[PDB]
Design a binder for this molecule. Structure first.
Ligand SMILES: CSC[C@H](NC(=O)Cc1ccccc1)C(=O)N[C@@H](Cc1ccccc1)[C@H](O)C(=O)N1CSC(C)(C)[C@H]1C(=O)N[C@H]1c2ccccc2C[C@H]1O
Ligand SMILES: C[C@H](CCC(=O)NCCC[N+](C)(C)CCCS(=O)(=O)[O-])[C@H]1CC[C@H]2[C@@H]3[C@H](O)C[C@@H]4C[C@H](O)CC[C@]4(C)[C@H]3C[C@H](O)[C@]12C
Ligand code: NA
Length: 327
């Protein structure tokens, strides 16, 4: 199985590296299960954000195949735009020709872009979520028979303790302890499963839960959040949807998620972010209120830091298991 090392960036996000072009041009990616396109910033970039990035130069790649088609990717955090290009993409020791976006304007993706040290985003979603109708990397590698299974695996790094791996094509027992529980997808094209959500006395039955690698938070329905925070001794930051607390706050709850198959819990230690610079013994909650059309939680980074996760295209399932504290 091919492995890609995952490095932590300030306990908000993680990255892994990969190559685009036979020139072996090396890029740092956010690895995002909730999107289905790959992009890298071009040498043709007109914007300030591209200043400090590894830039893609199609003139230095002999496997480059032109495709002028203009495209923009609209994320919740902003927009990047440019054009489609084709070239050899290499993930670990697995290569395949691939269609991706050459980004020339990142101004709509500020301040996220210039803030952090990633170059681009590598989607790990489903095909019907892609622009330009791009087969996902793992399913092509499967199809081309470079890996056993159409699946990938996340063992996330933890700040100041160990590194992580994205593993492609097969499941390695070393990453987790206890049982590995599979949860069927309740949607065709998202890593979305059904779970009862419990926080104290507040309960949502058969809630949609999206396992998502690119979101640095647990997201919660706004009504559910407003009930959770009632008398919690937490304070909202002015103008921003973030809550601050004493790290030691005895009332901070444990999320409990359950299926017929399993039980997954998330204790304060996984969703708190120390902000010692702002004040002594203060923490931010990595919890955001957000309403999808159907009541939904995003089980983001903080969930995935605790739980090893198996994303299975062939079995339309998400495997979940408690991550080992170190390898
Ligand atoms: C096919 S990509 C376009 C997609 N847009 C949508 O789904 C539109 C939408 C919006 C609200 C409800 C329902 C649907 C999208 O941006 N999805 C994102 C996940 C998402 C988040 C909220 C609501 C719906 C989907 C993406 O997978 C991601 O992690 N992204 C886009 S870019 C990113 C890799 C930096 C990261 C990010 O923004 N992360 C930030 C985020 C998002 C929500 C809560 C906290 C935070 C902090 C930070 O981590
Ligand atoms: C996705 C949700 C909800 C968006 C929403 O509720 N938007 C209503 C208006 C919708 N529009 C009319 C504009 C278009 C769609 C209408 S339509 O009906 O067509 O769908 C919004 C609301 C608050 C947003 C976060 C904060 O900012 C702080 C921070 C800023 C960074 O920079 C990026 C990260 C982060 C965490 C943000 C991410 C995300 O962005 C959040 C969660
Ligand atoms: Na995501």
């Amino acid at each position: 199985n091919d492995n890609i090392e995952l490095v932590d960036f300030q306990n908000i996000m993680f990255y892994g590296d990969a190559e685009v072009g036979d020139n072996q041009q090396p890029f740092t990616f956010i690895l995002d299960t909730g999107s289905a396109n790959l992009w890298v910033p071009s040498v043709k970039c007109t914007t300030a954000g591209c200043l400090t990035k590894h830039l893609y130069d199609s003139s230095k790649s002999r496997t480059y195949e032109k495709d002028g088609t203009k495209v923009e990717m609209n994320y919740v955090s902003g927009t990047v735009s440019g054009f489609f290009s084709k070239d050899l993409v290499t993930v670990g020791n697995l290569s395949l020709p691939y269609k991706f976006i050459e980004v020339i304007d990142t101004n709509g993706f500020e301040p996220t872009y210039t803030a952090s040290t990633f170059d681009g985003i590598l989607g790990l979603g489903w095909k019907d979520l892609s622009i330009g109708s791009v087969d996902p990397i793992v399913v092509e590698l499967k199809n081309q028979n470079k890996i056993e299974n159409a699946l990938f695996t996340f063992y996330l790094p933890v700040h100041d303790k160990h590194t992580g791996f994205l593993t492609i094509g097969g499941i390695e027992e070393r990453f987790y302890e206890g049982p590995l529980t599979y949860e069927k997808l309740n949607h065709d094209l998202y890593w979305q499963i059904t779970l009862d959500a419990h926080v104290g006395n507040i309960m949502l039955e058969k809630a949609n839960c999206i396992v998502d690698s690119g979101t640095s938070a647990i997201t919660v329905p706004t009504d559910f959040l407003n009930k959770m925070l009632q008398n919690l001794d937490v304070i909202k930051v002015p103008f921003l949807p973030f809550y601050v607390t004493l790290c030691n706050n005895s009332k901070l709850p444990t999320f409990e998620f359950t299926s017929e198959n399993g039980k997954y819990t998330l204790e304060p230690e996984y969703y708190l972010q120390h902000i010692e610079d702002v004040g002594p013994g203060l923490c931010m909650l990595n919890i955001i209120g957000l309403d999808f059309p159907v009541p939904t939680f995003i089980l983001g980074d903080p969930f995935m830091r605790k739980y090893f996760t198996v994303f299975d295209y062939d079995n339309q399932s998400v495997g979940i298991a408690l991550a080992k504290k170190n390898l």
